[PDB]
TrEMBL record:
<keyword id="KW-0813">Transport</keyword>
<dbReference type="GO" id="GO:0038023">
    <property type="term" value="F:signaling receptor activity"/>
</dbReference>
<keyword id="KW-0472">Membrane</keyword>
<keyword id="KW-0798">TonB box</keyword>
<dbReference type="GO" id="GO:0015344">
    <property type="term" value="F:siderophore uptake transmembrane transporter activity"/>
</dbReference>
<dbReference type="GO" id="GO:0015891">
    <property type="term" value="P:siderophore transport"/>
</dbReference>
<keyword id="KW-0862">Zinc</keyword>
<dbReference type="GO" id="GO:0007166">
    <property type="term" value="P:cell surface receptor signaling pathway"/>
</dbReference>
<comment type="similarity">
    <text>Belongs to the TonB-dependent receptor family.</text>
</comment>
<feature type="disulfide bond">
    <location>
        <begin position="655"/>
        <end position="661"/>
    </location>
</feature>
<dbReference type="GO" id="GO:0006829">
    <property type="term" value="P:zinc ion transport"/>
</dbReference>
<keyword id="KW-0675">Receptor</keyword>
<keyword id="KW-0410">Iron transport</keyword>
<keyword id="KW-0732">Signal</keyword>
<keyword id="KW-0408">Iron</keyword>
<keyword id="KW-0864">Zinc transport</keyword>
<protein>
    <recommendedName>
        <fullName>Metal-pseudopaline receptor CntO</fullName>
    </recommendedName>
</protein>
Amino acid sequence: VFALGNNLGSTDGYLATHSQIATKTSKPLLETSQTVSVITREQIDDTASKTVQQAMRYTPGIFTGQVGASNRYDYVVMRGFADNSVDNIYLDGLKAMGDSGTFSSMQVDPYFLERIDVLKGPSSVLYGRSLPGGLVALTSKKPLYEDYRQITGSIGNMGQKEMGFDFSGPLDEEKRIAYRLIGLGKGSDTQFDHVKEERYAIAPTLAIDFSDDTTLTLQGYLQHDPNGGYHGGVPADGTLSHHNGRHISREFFDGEPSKDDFDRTQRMFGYQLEHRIDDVWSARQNFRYLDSDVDLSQVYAYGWSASEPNKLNRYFSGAREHLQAYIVDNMLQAEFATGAARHTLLTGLDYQRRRTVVDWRSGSASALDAFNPVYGDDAISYFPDDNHTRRLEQTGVYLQDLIDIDQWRFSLGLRQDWVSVTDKNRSTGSKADDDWEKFTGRIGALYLFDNGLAPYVSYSESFNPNAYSDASGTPLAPTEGKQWELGLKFQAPGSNSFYTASLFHITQENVASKEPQDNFYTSVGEVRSQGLELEAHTQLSDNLKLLGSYTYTDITYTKSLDGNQGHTPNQAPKHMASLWADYAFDAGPLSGLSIGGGARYVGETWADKENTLRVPDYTLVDARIGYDLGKLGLKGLDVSLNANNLLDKDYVASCYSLDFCYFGEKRNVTATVNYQF
Ligand SMILES: CCCCCCCCO[C@@H]1O[C@H](CO)[C@@H](O)[C@H](O)[C@H]1O
Ligand SMILES: CCCCCCCCO[C@@H]1O[C@H](CO)[C@@H](O)[C@H](O)[C@H]1O
Ligand SMILES: [N+]
Ligand code: NA
């Protein structure tokens, strides 16, 4: 079997045994000196997680509430790092290649995924530019070598509707060629008035074995979102407190007129080539091209009107964006012994090239009453247009040696990146340009006791281009993450249970900062995140599956020029916890029935960086019920019922500032039918 670039991990219920996210080569979770979580297909289905972001709500060290109920983008806040949270997603070993300085961030639909792997903390040594919180790797469904056919249909509240199919199998007598074809159409009204979500997608994959030494997998992914749900927010003033009227803004309130529009087309093609040279030497090339179009028209609230008392001031954003992106990763691995030491030595060259053409519009809109709005006044007073061509190039050369000797498992990593970023202002003709090089490193040591207890330590580094620029308008120095991590993992042999504790201390340097009167940003800011994560997978009964998590996060601006030094970032709960359980009857009359549910806790959050107002804590409840009607003599047919936020709590999930607060999703009920053959 082929380790390089594959997880190759067994999965049973909600627990995987192996990953490649931390190493680019199959490694037991138990023998990996980093915090790795895995969210299985079964967990996604059982919790009715409708997006990647929602799939993470049972994982420690992840906050799922950055823009509350919005499903437009996947925001995964890791270890309290909210900034550039959209850019944490990798798909099939490759950076998604969205542009986080634009509206062109992509979304991968969960129905195409086999599993979600989550790596905590700085991880640039294998991936290049990334955030200090970690990163998420989506693994797409791959061709099967036995015929597999699934049709599925879902119906819910809020006008939810989905149909999908998933067909796979061999094409030849010899079973050397196999396909998979997955398609999907879906819709929702949301909780919000006048809002639609809508998506049509298809993903063909073909896998071909040339010999026992070579597999090529060809992949396409075409997705059209002609509607983009809701992506707004409203003041703390009337959400966290009553405003004037003694009113609160409703969880269904819509701040825009029907001059609203979000149209996203994503067109991806790629391949994965796996080649065994020797029992020692293996090589792999992962490639993906992306081409997307985004069209946006959005009127949004921004603060209360100075003159008109229960009306919100509004503005308009308009965008027409075309994103092109190439990414390739070239890996060569040698597995070999030198005396008592076994080496798994990886060398790699990767390359990212991105161009985003953006035509931006903006203006002033009419004011809107925040209770009993009257739509139809959609005239916009337009400000100056703002058109850009943005380019990024990243070349990475990296080395890694995993050294296993006796019960020790060591990891040594080094990477050099050459980065070039350009911004051509097509309105003004001016061009900002920037080229630099960064070295990142990682060192891990883990001791595997033969009882399945594994203490470890890790030092790991990250960088990311700075989103801010100086006086001159050449960008600041890239931010930098540095983490010391101490952990303990434990799995009792055979028992399908797995427990981890992780302690972390992350420093992020060269963060943009200024005096508030000041014009120039300088790269003198610093952020420190430290804490504890606990994760438990317990499979008792063989009919009973449990997940539990606890997260403690202490994050602070340790150096700031703006008066917020020593404050806690907003959108950063100190305390979170979760628990999910699922029971299946094999035994009795009830064979085929399954019942499940859980609870999620988010602690209090600051609504603002100035730390003047709290978002209250909240506990949410989820539940499910499933039946295999196979058991009653009609095979491959099963149904499920899910309710997330079962008590229908009406709450603010988080705030970006005092002006922008986001409601959590109201009760979401779905009924699903799955038909195999
Ligand atoms: C069980 C709950 C189902 C309610 C679905 C929410 C849909 C509310 O929003 C709908 O959006 C349309 C688009 O402009 C409007 O024209 C409709 O009048 C409005 O009902
Ligand atoms: C879990 C242990 C964390 C110890 C480091 C915290 C002290 C401040 O931060 C440290 O500053 C040092 C420079 O003085 C650097 O060498 C370290 O990489 C950095 O983490
Ligand atoms: N504005
Ligand atoms: Na399957």
